[PDB]
C-alpha cells in the first residue's frame, strides 16, 4: 500500500512530513533483507534517521529527497554500529550532510567496519539525550532504552506525529524471531523494549528497521519474546 519504487528502494509515506525509506541487501541462508529509515521534513529542512545498506543506495535515497522534497539534509541520525544502519556513512559526509550517533556507535564503529559519525550524542539517566549534544534536532526525539539489540541502539519519536521509531530493537506483532541477536543484551532486551514504549506512550504508528510499521503490539510482542532471552 502506498509503495513508491525509486531505484532499488521504495519509499512510503507515512505521514504528512515523514516518509520510511526501504533498501534491500542479499544474505545467506536467507534472501533479500529489508532495512528501513526515516525521512523527515522540518520547515525548510530535510532530517534523515539511519542511512541504507551501501554508500549507493544511500546516495539514491539522496537523490529522491532532491526529486520529491528538493530541500536540504541538514543532519542524519544513525541508531547503531550495523551495516544496515551505518552502511552509507561515506555518501552523507561526500553530500556535506551533518551526522550524529550514539559516542557507543561511534566508539565501535571503526572495527565492525563502518565509518564514523562526526557526531555524539550522549544520555542522561533517563535516557533522554542530552539536548545540547543533538542542536537542530526539530521535531526528533532521541531516546537511549538501554541494552537490546545492540548495546548502543537508540529510538526516535517525531514531534507532532503520532509515529516512534524502534530501529533493529522492536519486531513486529507477529514476527517470528528477535532477528539477529550476535550483538544482543539478552538480559535488559526486554526492559529496554518496554522502556521505549515508556518514552513515546502516544505513539499508535511503530516504525521499525525490519518489518512494516504496525501497532504498539510490536512492542508488547517484541518484549514478550525477548522476556524468553533472560
Ligand atoms: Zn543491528
Ligand atoms: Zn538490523
Same mark, same amino acid.
Given at each position: 500500500?502506498?509503495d513508491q519504487r525509486?531505484?532499488?528502494?521504495v519509499?512510503?509515506?507515512?505521514?504528512?512530513? %515523514?516518509?520510511?525509506?526501504?533498501?534491500?541487501?542479499?544474505?545467506?541462508?536467507?534472501?533479500?533483507?529489508?532495512?528501513?529509515?526515516? /525521512?523527515?521534513?522540518?520547515?525548510?529542512? %530535510?532530517?534523515?534517521?539511519?542511512?541504507?545498506?551501501?554508500d549507493?543506495?544511500?546516495?539514491? /535515497?539522496?537523490?529522491? /529527497?532532491?526529486?520529491?522534497?528538493?530541500?536540504? %539534509?541538514?543532519l542524519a541520525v544513525?541508531?547503531?554500529?550495523?551495516?544496515?544502519k551505518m552502511?552509507? &556513512?561515506?555518501?552523507?559526509?561526500?553530500a556535506?550532510?551533518?551526522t550524529?550517533?550514539?559516542?557507543?556507535?561511534?566508539?565501535?564503529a571503526?572495527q565492525?567496519?563502518?565509518?564514523?559519525?562526526?557526531?555524539? !550524542?550522549?544520555?542522561?539517566?533517563?535516557?533522554?539525550?542530552?539536548?545540547?549534544?543533538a542542536?537542530?534536532?526539530?521535531?526528533?526525539?532521541?531516546?537511549?532504552?538501554?541494552?537490546?539489540?545492540?548495546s548502543?541502539? /537508540?529510538?526516535?519519536?517525531?514531534?507532532?506525529?503520532?509515529?516512534?521509531?524502534?530501529?533493529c530493537?522492536?519486531?513486529?506483532?507477529?514476527?517470528?524471531?528477535?532477528?539477529?541477536?550476535?550483538?544482543?543484551?539478552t538480559?535488559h532486551?526486554?526492559?529496554?523494549?518496554?522502556?521505549?514504549?515508556?518514552?513515546?506512550?502516544?505513539?499508535? &504508528?511503530?516504525?521499525?528497521?525490519?518489518?512494516?510499521?504496525?501497532?504498539?503490539?510490536?512492542?508488547?510482542?517484541?518484549?514478550?519474546?525477548?522476556?524468553? !532471552?533472560?
Amino acid at each position: 500500500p502506498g509503495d513508491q519504487r525509486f531505484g532499488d528502494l521504495v519509499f512510503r509515506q507515512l505521514a504528512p512530513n %515523514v516518509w520510511q525509506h526501504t533498501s534491500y541487501l542479499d544474505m545467506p541462508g536467507f534472501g533479500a533483507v529489508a532495512s528501513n529509515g526515516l /525521512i523527515v521534513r522540518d520547515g525548510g529542512r %530535510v532530517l534523515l534517521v539511519d542511512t541504507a545498506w551501501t554508500d549507493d543506495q544511500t546516495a539514491q /535515497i539522496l537523490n529522491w /529527497i532532491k526529486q520529491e522534497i528538493n530541500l536540504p %539534509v541538514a543532519l542524519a541520525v544513525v541508531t547503531h554500529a550495523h551495516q544496515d544502519k551505518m552502511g552509507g &556513512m561515506d555518501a552523507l559526509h561526500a553530500a556535506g550532510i551533518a551526522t550524529y550517533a550514539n559516542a557507543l556507535s561511534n566508539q565501535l564503529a571503526p572495527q565492525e567496519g563502518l565509518v564514523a559519525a562526526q557526531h555524539s !550524542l550522549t544520555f542522561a539517566a533517563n535516557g533522554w539525550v542530552e539536548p545540547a549534544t543533538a542542536p537542530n534536532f526539530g521535531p526528533l526525539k532521541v531516546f537511549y532504552p538501554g541494552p537490546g539489540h545492540t548495546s548502543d541502539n /537508540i529510538t526516535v519519536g517525531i514531534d507532532g506525529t503520532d509515529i516512534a521509531f524502534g530501529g533493529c530493537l522492536i519486531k513486529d506483532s507477529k514476527a517470528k524471531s528477535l532477528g539477529n541477536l550476535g550483538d544482543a543484551d539478552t538480559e535488559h532486551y526486554a526492559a529496554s523494549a518496554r522502556a521505549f514504549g515508556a518514552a513515546f506512550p502516544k505513539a499508535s &504508528m511503530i516504525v521499525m528497521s525490519h518489518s512494516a510499521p504496525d501497532s504498539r503490539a510490536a512492542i508488547t510482542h517484541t518484549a514478550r519474546m525477548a522476556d524468553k !532471552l533472560r
